[PDB]
RNA sequence: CGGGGAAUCAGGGUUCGAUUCCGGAGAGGGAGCCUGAGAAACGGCUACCACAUCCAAGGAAGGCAGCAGGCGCGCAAAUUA
RNA sequence: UUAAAUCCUUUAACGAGGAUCCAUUGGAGGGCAAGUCUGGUGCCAAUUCCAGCUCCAAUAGCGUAUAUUAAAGUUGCUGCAGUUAAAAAGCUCGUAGUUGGAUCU
RNA sequence: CAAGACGGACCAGAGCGAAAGCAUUUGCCAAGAAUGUUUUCAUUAAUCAAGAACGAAAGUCGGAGGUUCGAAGACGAUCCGUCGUAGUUCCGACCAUAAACGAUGCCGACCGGCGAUGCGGCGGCGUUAUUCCCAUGACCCGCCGGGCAGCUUCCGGGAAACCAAAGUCUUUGGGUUCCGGGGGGAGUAUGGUUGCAAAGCUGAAACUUAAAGGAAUUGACGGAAGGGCACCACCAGGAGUGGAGCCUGCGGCUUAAUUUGCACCCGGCCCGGACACGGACAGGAUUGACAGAUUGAUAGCUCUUUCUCGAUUCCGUGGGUGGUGGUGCAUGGCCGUUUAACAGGUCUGUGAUGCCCUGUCCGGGGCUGCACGCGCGCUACACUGACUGGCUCAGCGUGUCCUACGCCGGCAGGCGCGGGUAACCCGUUGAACCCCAUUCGUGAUGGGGAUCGGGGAUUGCAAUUAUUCCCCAUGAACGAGGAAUUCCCAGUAAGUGCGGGUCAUAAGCUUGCGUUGAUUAAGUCCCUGCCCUUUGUACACACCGCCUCGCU
């Protein structure tokens, strides 16, 4: 209310020096330049590991051995059954290299020798940028994480000179889609080889969080001491350079293709290839050595028919969101017994600890995941554990391995190990957000097996797909929709984020088809999947704010068991179940407004869903990938 | 760095000019010279300071704010034709 | 052409119907140009998020950020104000600086 | 008698001062504006950075004095009171700040009217100084100058309040000084400087925000206030229901219904489409029926037994219409009514006209049955009385059911004979209260009458759950009625009887009528209800302030 003129309201009474700046700049610049000089001096030099360079030809038209001749200063040519990986020492530029090669389509080979490489040298043909296979390996490499890379074109000087300049111009477009701001170097003669080696030697290094937070190692030499040959299990001796952090023997060691192992000793023999031309220092004892306790120690044409059926199921679940027909034989209070109805999907609460299954008795939990992650990261960043640290060529005595791993190194498969962080070997629930790659559009059922690449770890498992929303509960997606990003929930060993998430489908011919890509969101079992089931029916008698609906049920007590569930329609109004007619599922509903004859009455049933125990740590080696 | 100059422009003004023309200054920071008509010259020498190269450990050699090219810096800039 | 070339210019031959030999970038349903539109997704018919259609502008270009200038008479010499809106000093004597009546054919 | 303080009323529309400020007489001192001027000097001026004088109150340092008042403080109440410290007073040093205001630099020019006021000057009749013996003072008239302050004004200006400056401003320049640049941060930090101190002067940035602010006109608005009217409001009263019994109405409780704002209930009849499709049908579809029975009763309208009529047919399923349906509009004739007119209308006609659907008679019961709350009435709760007997007074009306008269029966009531279609007969309307006389005697009693048993008569087809009356046998509650209020000012309330309407018979509702006849008042808005005027002041809304904790 506004006061009148008779209301008494009084009018308010209104009542450094330039030399010093230059000196400061000099001091800060000296600090930054000395720190950067130390960081650049570590890699490739006499106080660090060799600079590891993985060479990948992105086209089938590239002759890899002649390029390897060009890159090869003294060469120590180590080789395997099919691959040749050679060390290169050059005191002219004072730099040490380990040059490895990998053909695209060998998924484990390229992914492993790129997840230890410091540099990736891509090779291109002058005509096109890359084939479909090179595109596939580039998609996988972008998914896993790229270190420093360098682009080189191989046969530009084989073309006539009249086109050569224009060719490079054209190939710039063929590069600008995926490598937008990157120069193209040439590999024709020894002189360009020296220039390329110089570009690789002095270059800014991309640093990757997953492999620098954990100590890792690429095994240069591997041999075996079997305890019993009939047992096919014995002590393994793997020699390579310490790469990421200080290697402490009291932590578990993961081999990327064979899982976790306990390691007993770290010895430091002489460096076989030092830059400028038997002693053991550590011990085993199990007073703090972690144990391998992943589980709680306390106790023809039918395939095409199935594929078309899955296509039709994806179409139906796309066009009907969650509609499932009521069974005419089984009682709805029995088939849907473990279901409840929610007035509110978003705001109505749900107990995270209600009705936990047996499998959650086999996993671990965090009282606070964020505080634990900060504590372990602060410990691994600030403290300095008394172990073999970065630079020395060490040899690992690891306790028990299967023998076949040794045989793997005899064909040419790289052997890469890394020390786990604490709490990594323990199983839990991993929720990891994924998005679908456009190259593949085959249907993906939610509870089918898939191959997961998560943070140096490969395993076969069955996830659950749910929506990535901002609510406390997330509805189940039974098909991986190829437009948005969903969340896969799985039983998996604990991996502390960040880490890359690659999903693959095992095809019939042995190839892995890429499906997903992304980051591990969190590791917590308190996330829940909510299966949402629609029952629908016809309001066959419509009156003023009161309707008679059929085709919901077929018994009479099925209405009574599901009475307190409110109803909704496709056209917007809600409704409440008043009372059944009898014996046939006909039932009177109370509605806030009038219903159309073409309207359909619906209700939802909710059930809390948890993943399945499908964790297989063995991933078979694919055949080389090819475009179909 | 200064000027000729650029942008806007009713008129007055305002903002910019490191930058190919003119003048000045410096050649990692200071200093002292030799020769020469002319230099306090650095693609000349001599020291100190700061960095840094080869070495047989005795010694020797250094100056891209020239053209390319690299690292670093960064929001930010091209071929060792 | 030129040192030798490239490009342009000049000319043989081939080279256009979905002439697929396919123009983008932004904005619009409060105000300057441009909407009585649709479909999913949640809260108690209103209502968060997402994909679109239709329209509009400039066009081989069009957004964005930052600085600055013009709009701006919000720095005012031209050309602002100072009762009640930001603002005139407690008051007067109180040197420099600024301004200084009329008059000589 | 003394000490310190302060100069009211006169005292303003005043005056003076640079401002702060300035009110007892007298004397002294040194200044000052305006006025007057045919004096002098002759540009000597205007405005302020620097620097300097003064600067209310409170405050600080030395003294003196301490009446009143009085921060603090001690007490007593719960913004006040008693006592009173520093102070308030004077002198000498500091401090230099105020809403230190016209919230409005200073100097100069130009630009409306008016009649008042303060000082000076000029001109002028008159009245006064107990006619004043000339001037002088006080008044009176007019003018000039510098003031303080008003009223007025399409000078113009302003966003408006308003301004003779806040004008002469986009048609933008008289001179000069200080000073603002959205709101906060913030007059804060920092440095300098002044001060004995309290503090004074100078004075940011980071950051943060989309506003901040000025002026004016306004509907509605629970309400609020002034009045007025009213016994459906009040004061003083009268009669009281509400206290008891009976009766009646809303709910509530039972019930088959106790209908409802003969409508109800229990049983038996009667009839109740065509269209399409599929069935039965002359071997016979279907109609009529003697007789007996079921039934509260009979009845071919039913349950048996077959006589006859023969196409006049009869069974089922449809979300398909619908017709002996209800309803409105345009529509042509026809009454009575005030050429004309039908808001009174009427009448078998027209639109494949819009819409919504596809009960009769008979018998019985019930129509408040009753624990109750919700309201009107009758009777009495006794001595101003009850019983009995005697005496003596009306009116409004009504009547082919009002009745006179005679006989009988103790009475309700029967029989016969006349009057009345009405100021004619009932009827001189022989009424009841009231009066007189007897008995009763303060006693749930000769008060009061309910509820009961028997008998008789009347009204009706029928009186059972008593239609109604009469007589006898019983005398329950009822002791003047606690907190809502109903009606009322003269032949009125109240007491008391008598008629009309409803009625084959009630007595219970409403209307009136007459008889005896009271208390209080000629007032009021205290309450209630209604009608006015003012207002959006009061409360509320609104302003602003005050607006959760716990580890890493």
């Amino acid at each position: 209310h506004r006061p009148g003129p008779l209301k008494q309201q009084n009018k308010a009474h209104k009542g450094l020096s330039r030399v010093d700046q230059r000196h400061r700049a000099s001091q800060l610049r000296k600090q930054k330049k000395e720190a950067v000089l130390a960081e650049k001096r570590q890699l490739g030099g006499k106080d660090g590991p060799p600079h590891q360079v993985l060479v990948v030809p992105l086209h089938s038209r590239i002759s890899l051995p002649e390029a390897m001749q060009l890159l090869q200063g003294t060469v120590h040519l180590n080789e395997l059954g099919n691959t040749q990986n050679f060390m290169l020492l050059c005191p002219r530029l004072k730099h040490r290299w380990f040059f490895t090669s990998a053909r695209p389509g060998d998924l484990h080979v390229v992914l492993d020798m790129a997840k230890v490489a410091d540099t990736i040298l891509f090779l291109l043909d002058p005509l096109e940028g890359w084939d479909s296979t090179g595109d596939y390996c580039l998609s996988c490499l972008f998914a896993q994480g790229l270190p420093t890379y360098t682009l080189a074109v191989q046969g530009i000087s084989g073309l006539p000179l009249k086109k050569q300049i224009d060719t490079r111009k054209k190939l710039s477009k063929a590069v600008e889609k995926r490598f937008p701001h990157d120069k193209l170097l040439l590999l024709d003669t020894q002189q360009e080889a020296g220039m390329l080696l110089r570009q690789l030697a002095n270059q800014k290094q991309q640093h990757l969080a997953f492999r620098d937070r954990r100590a890792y190692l690429f095994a240069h030499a591997v041999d075996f001491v079997p305890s019993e040959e009939n047992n096919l299990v014995g002590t393994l001796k793997i020699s390579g350079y310490v790469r990421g952090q200080t290697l402490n023997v009291n932590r578990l060691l993961h081999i990327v293709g064979y899982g976790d192992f306990q390691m007993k000793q770290i010895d430091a023999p002489g460096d076989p290839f030092p830059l400028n031309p038997k002693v053991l220092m550590k011990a085993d004892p199990g007073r703090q050595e972690s144990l391998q306790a992943e589980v709680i120690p306390d106790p023809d044409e039918e395939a095409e028919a199935k594929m078309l059926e899955k296509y039709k199921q994806e179409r139906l679940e796309e066009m009907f969101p969650d509609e499932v027909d009521t069974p005419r034989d089984v009682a709805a209070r029995i088939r849907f017994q473990k279901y409840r109805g929610l007035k509110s999907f978003r705001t109505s609460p749900w107990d995270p600890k209600e009705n936990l299954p047996q499998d959650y008795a086999r996993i671990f939990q965090f009282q606070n995941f964020t505080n634990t992650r900060k504590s372990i990261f602060k410990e691994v960043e600030e403290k300095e554990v008394e172990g073999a640290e970065v630079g020395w060529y060490v040899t690992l005595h690891v306790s028990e391995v299967p023998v076949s791993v040794v045989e793997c190194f005899r064909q040419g498969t790289p052997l890469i190990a890394f020390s786990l962080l604490p709490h990594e070997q323990k199983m839990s629930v991993l929720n990891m957000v994924v998005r679908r790659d456009p190259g593949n559009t085959e249907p993906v059922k939610a509870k089918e097996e898939l191959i997961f690449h998560c943070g140096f770890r490969r395993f076969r498992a069955s996830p659950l797909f749910s929506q990535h929303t901002a609510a406390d509960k997330h509805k189940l997606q039974r098909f991986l929709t190829a437009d948005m990003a969903l969340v896969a929930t799985v039983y998996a060993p604990i991996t502390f984020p960040p880490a890359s998430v690659l999903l693959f489908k095992q095809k019939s011919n042995g190839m892995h088809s890429l499906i997903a890509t992304g980051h591990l969101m969190s590791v917590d079992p308190d996330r829940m999947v909510i299966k949402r089931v629609v029952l629908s029916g016809h309001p066959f008698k419509i009156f003023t704010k009161m309707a008679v609906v059929r085709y919901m049920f077929f018994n009479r007590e099925d209405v009574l068991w599901f009475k307190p569930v409110e109803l909704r329609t496709k056209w917007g109004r809600r409704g409440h179940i008043k009372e059944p007619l009898g014996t046939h599922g006909h039932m009177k509903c109370s509605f806030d407004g009038k219903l159309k004859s073409q309207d359909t009455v619906l209700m939802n049933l909710y059930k809390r869903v948890f993943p399945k125990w499908t964790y297989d740590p063995y991933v078979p080696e694919p055949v080389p990938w090819l475009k179909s």
Side-chain angles (χ1 to χ4, degrees), chain A residues 1-19 21-381 383 385 387-620 622-628:
Chain A
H1 172 67
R2 170 196 53 78
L6 272 300
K7 186 61 163 75
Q8 183 67 41
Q9 190 262 6
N10 300 58
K11 184 170 174 63
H13 168 73
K14 311 290 171 60
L16 284 189
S17 57
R18 197 202 57 80
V19 175
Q21 305 171 28
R22 198 70 169 251
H23 177 236
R24 206 170 83 75
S26 177
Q27 281 168 308
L28 301 183
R29 175 176 74 213
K30 223 190 285 193
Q31 287 180 172
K32 290 185 47 76
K33 285 179 76 183
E34 269 157 355
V36 166
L37 171 62
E39 194 261 0
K40 297 190 90 73
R41 175 192 52 171
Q42 183 178 2
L43 177 60
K46 66 200 215 167
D47 56 352
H51 194 118
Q52 206 198 336
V53 181
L54 167 68
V55 187
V56 179
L58 295 175
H59 207 279
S60 65
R61 279 203 276 270
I62 299 301
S63 167
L64 180 53
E66 62 86 20
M68 294 296 172
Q69 287 295 109
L70 279 182
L71 297 180
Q72 78 190 4
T74 178
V75 189
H76 294 125
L77 197 147
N78 183 21
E79 76 261 24
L80 302 175
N82 52 3
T83 60
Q84 65 182 357
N85 305 320
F86 60 98
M87 199 87 101
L88 181 63
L89 305 171
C90 194
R92 197 262 302 261
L93 306 89
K94 293 186 286 185
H95 211 272
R96 172 166 61 161
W97 314 90
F98 190 51
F99 277 104
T100 74
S101 75
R103 312 209 81 96
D106 301 334
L107 275 296
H108 301 308
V109 173
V110 295
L111 279 194
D112 291 331
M113 271 186 318
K115 78 177 72 170
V116 291
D118 313 278
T119 316
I120 300 188
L121 178 62
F122 294 113
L123 301 188
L124 276 74
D125 51 326
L127 309 179
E128 306 150 59
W130 50 77
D131 289 330
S132 297
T133 317
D135 196 6
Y136 174 83
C137 82
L138 272 173
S139 308
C140 295
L141 283 191
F142 271 49
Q144 172 162 268
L146 266 189
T148 300
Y149 60 92
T150 314
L151 279 297
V153 180
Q154 195 183 50
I156 186 66
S157 304
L159 300 171
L161 184 64
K162 175 203 213 162
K163 287 273 180 103
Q164 279 186 4
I165 278 166
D166 290 330
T167 300
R168 302 180 72 185
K169 184 165 209 145
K170 278 161 176 286
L171 193 148
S172 296
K173 292 171 72 176
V175 170
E176 74 181 358
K177 187 54 139 32
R178 194 187 285 267
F179 313 105
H181 309 117
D182 287 278
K183 314 296 160 145
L184 294 160
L185 281 73
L186 307 187
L187 262 177
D188 296 330
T189 64
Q190 191 69 32
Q191 213 263 340
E192 286 172 6
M195 300 175 80
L196 182 63
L197 267 294
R198 175 173 156 260
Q199 176 68 59
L200 294 185
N202 309 306
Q203 198 185 17
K204 180 183 191 89
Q205 292 292 128
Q206 174 69 252
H207 290 311
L208 301 173
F210 191 84
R211 76 176 192 191
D212 70 20
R213 196 99 53 199
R214 304 160 177 78
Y216 64 103
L217 191 141
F218 179 86
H220 274 279
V222 173
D223 53 353
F224 198 44
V225 174
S227 59
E228 284 89 6
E229 268 282 0
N230 49 4
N231 203 4
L232 294 174
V233 160
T235 315
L236 186 59
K237 294 310 319 303
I238 46 172
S239 63
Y241 300 87
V242 186
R243 297 301 305 266
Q245 285 259 352
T246 297
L247 181 53
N248 183 19
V249 68
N250 300 327
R251 299 228 201 91
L252 298 194
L253 189 79
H254 177 94
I255 302 181
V256 290
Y258 305 99
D260 310 337
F261 301 96
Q262 270 192 336
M263 65 182 179
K264 65 160 72 73
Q265 202 180 5
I266 297 169
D267 298 342
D271 203 332
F273 317 116
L275 189 43
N276 298 106
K278 191 262 290 180
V279 57
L280 61 84
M281 40 76 68
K282 264 190 99 165
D284 56 345
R287 79 289 185 275
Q288 313 214 0
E289 173 181 45
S290 59
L291 74 164
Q292 300 177 0
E294 63 271 21
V295 180
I296 300 296
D298 177 86
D300 180 88
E301 61 86 20
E302 82 279 357
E304 192 83 358
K306 283 189 86 173
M307 206 46 177
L308 271 295
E309 204 268 346
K310 271 185 94 148
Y311 264 110
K312 288 297 302 163
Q313 278 181 350
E314 185 177 2
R315 211 183 97 83
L316 292 173
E317 292 289 327
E318 273 163 351
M319 183 277 288
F320 301 111
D322 274 304
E323 291 197 18
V324 175
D325 290 331
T326 307
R328 280 185 172 92
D329 50 354
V330 192
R333 80 200 160 273
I334 297 294
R335 184 45 254 182
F336 293 99
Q337 170 175 14
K338 299 288 96 176
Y339 280 81
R340 74 189 62 169
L342 275 299
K343 179 181 182 293
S344 178
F345 183 73
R346 188 170 84 183
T347 57
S348 283
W350 191 308
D351 202 287
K353 318 250 181 197
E354 186 274 338
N355 200 4
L356 301 178
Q358 300 78 10
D359 289 321
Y360 287 171
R362 282 158 92 203
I363 73 180
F364 289 77
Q365 291 179 355
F366 282 98
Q367 68 275 17
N368 198 359
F369 182 76
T370 293
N371 192 0
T372 312
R373 204 198 80 264
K374 287 180 67 66
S375 176
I376 62 183
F377 282 175
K378 184 171 231 294
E379 183 214 359
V380 75
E381 191 95 0
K383 324 268 164 181
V385 60
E389 65 183 1
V390 59
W392 291 271
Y393 179 86
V394 309
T395 299
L396 277 296
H397 307 240
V398 301
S399 282
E400 70 265 11
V401 297
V403 69
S404 62
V405 182
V406 179
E407 270 89 3
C408 294
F409 204 99
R410 313 310 219 181
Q411 290 86 19
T413 77
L415 184 63
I416 291 167
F418 80 101
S419 174
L420 286 84
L421 287 184
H423 287 352
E424 288 268 284
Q425 82 273 47
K426 298 169 182 175
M427 281 286 248
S428 166
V429 159
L430 276 68
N431 322 297
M432 41 166 68
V433 55
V434 294
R435 208 150 161 160
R436 265 204 87 169
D437 175 82
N440 187 281
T441 45
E442 270 72 17
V444 189
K445 157 189 197 61
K447 283 172 290 322
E448 77 184 60
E449 67 82 20
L450 291 166
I451 299 145
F452 286 76
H453 295 223
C454 176
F456 278 45
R457 205 191 296 269
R458 302 178 312 220
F459 55 90
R460 279 191 303 179
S462 297
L464 294 174
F465 302 143
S466 63
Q467 283 179 344
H468 188 230
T469 60
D472 45 6
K473 57 182 96 70
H474 317 280
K475 54 193 281 273
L476 188 153
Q477 291 288 318
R478 64 221 51 191
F479 277 86
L480 193 64
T481 47
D483 297 74
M484 295 298 103
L486 308 182
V487 180
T489 303
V490 70
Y491 292 123
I494 285 170
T495 300
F496 288 111
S500 60
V501 177
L502 283 74
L503 263 66
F504 295 97
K505 182 178 177 67
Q506 175 64 259
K507 278 179 70 172
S508 305
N509 56 4
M511 308 174 167
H512 296 350
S513 160
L514 172 80
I515 282 177
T517 44
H519 56 106
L520 174 53
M521 163 167 40
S522 180
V523 183
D524 55 333
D526 285 331
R527 201 172 189 274
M528 64 184 73
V529 177
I530 299 305
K531 184 176 175 67
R532 194 260 211 180
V533 184
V534 176
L535 305 169
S536 62
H538 292 54
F540 73 103
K541 284 302 172 32
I542 300 165
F543 304 127
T544 61
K545 288 174 70 177
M546 183 278 288
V548 194
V549 186
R550 67 178 161 182
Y551 295 149
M552 300 315 178
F553 294 101
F554 307 110
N555 300 101
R556 195 178 163 279
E557 66 271 14
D558 275 344
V559 180
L560 294 174
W561 200 228
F562 292 165
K563 182 164 170 150
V565 188
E566 303 95 352
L567 318 186
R568 279 162 133 179
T569 60
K570 278 173 158 46
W571 269 107
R573 304 142 291 290
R574 80 178 74 188
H576 187 13
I577 291 166
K578 291 199 294 288
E579 56 177 357
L581 189 43
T583 309
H584 287 295
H586 293 205
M587 182 277 288
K588 278 76 69 177
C589 304
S590 71
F591 264 80
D592 44 8
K594 202 93 161 170
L595 296 177
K596 313 302 198 40
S597 68
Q598 71 267 18
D599 207 359
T600 299
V601 191
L602 278 63
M603 72 291 291
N604 290 318
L605 294 174
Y606 303 97
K607 168 191 165 202
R608 193 173 178 185
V609 187
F610 293 154
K612 314 312 141 193
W613 183 258
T614 63
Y615 175 68
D616 192 8
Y618 161 78
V619 187
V623 294
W625 190 83
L626 273 176
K627 184 52 181 323
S628 173

